[PDB]
Design a protein around this ligand. Sequence first.
Ligand SMILES: O=C(O)c1ccc(-c2ccccc2OC(F)(F)F)o1
Ligand SMILES: [Mn+2]
Ligand SMILES: [Mn+2]
Ligand code: NA
Length: 262
Amino acid sequence: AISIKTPEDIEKMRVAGRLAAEVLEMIEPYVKPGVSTGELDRICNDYIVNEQHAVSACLGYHGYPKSVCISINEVVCHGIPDDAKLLKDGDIVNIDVTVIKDGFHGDTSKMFIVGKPTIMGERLCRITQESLYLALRMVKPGINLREIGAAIQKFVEAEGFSVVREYCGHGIGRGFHEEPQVLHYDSRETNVVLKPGMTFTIEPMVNAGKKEIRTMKDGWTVKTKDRSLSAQYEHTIVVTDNGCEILTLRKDDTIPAIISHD
Ligand SMILES: O=C(O)c1ccc(-c2ccccc2OC(F)(F)F)o1
Ligand SMILES: [Mn+2]
Ligand SMILES: [Mn+2]
Ligand code: NA
C-alpha cells in the first residue's frame, strides 16, 4: 500500500522539504570554479546540523560516506564529494540533498552551471528541469504514474536525449525510500493511481547521449557509458485533492508551489 500522510505528517514534510530546499539555496554562492566537491559537502553538512538542527539522511545510508551527493558532467548520480575534485568553468553539477527533521524526509536536487555556461550544458539542464515541471503539472488524484513516466520520456527523447532506467522517484516520509516507485519512462509494469495525501519524489536523470550507464570501482559513482553529459532535478511533493504542492520549492524555481487543477 501507499502511505497516505495525515495533515500533521504533511506539515512535518513541509518543514523537512523546506530545509532540504534551503540547503540548495545556501550552497549556491559556493558553487564556483576552483572549489572542491569535498568542501561543498562539509559546508552543506555543517549547515544542516548546526543551523537547521537536522541530519543528512544520506550520510551512512546503505553505507554512503558523505552528507550529500555531488555529480559532475558525465557522472549520472551518487557522485562522492572529494577534496581533490575541483569544479571548473563550463561544468554542470548536481547537488542532491536529503534531510531528516522531526522524523520526516525532504529530498531535492538541482543543477548548477559553473563559470561560463556552454549552450549544450545549459540546454540539457533546462530540458531536464522542464521534464520535471511537465510531470509536476500532471500530478492529481486519479492519474496513473505510468502516464507521467510516459510524458517525461516522450518530452526528453523528443529533444534527442535519453532517460536513465536504473533509477526512479519514490514514495517518501518517515522512510527515505518508500513505495511507490516513480519511473520516468513508460513501463508495462507501472500501475499506480494517485490518491490525495501521497508524498513522493519525481527526479528524472537525463543523458545527452545514450541511456546506458556504468558504475565505477568505488561502489557508488555512476557515469554514462558513452561518457555524455547527464543532468537531474528533483522535488518532493504531496498530492492534494485537485493536484499537488511542491514541498521543496526554491526561490529560483520557475513554477508555483501549489499547482491546482480546479
Ligand atoms: O534522491 C534519491 O532518492 C537518492 C540519492 C541517492 C540515493 C541513494 C540510494 C541508494 C543508496 C545510496 C544513495 O545515496 C545516498 F546514500 F546518498 F542517499 O537515493
Ligand atoms: Mn535526492
Ligand atoms: Mn529521491
Ligand atoms: Na552529470
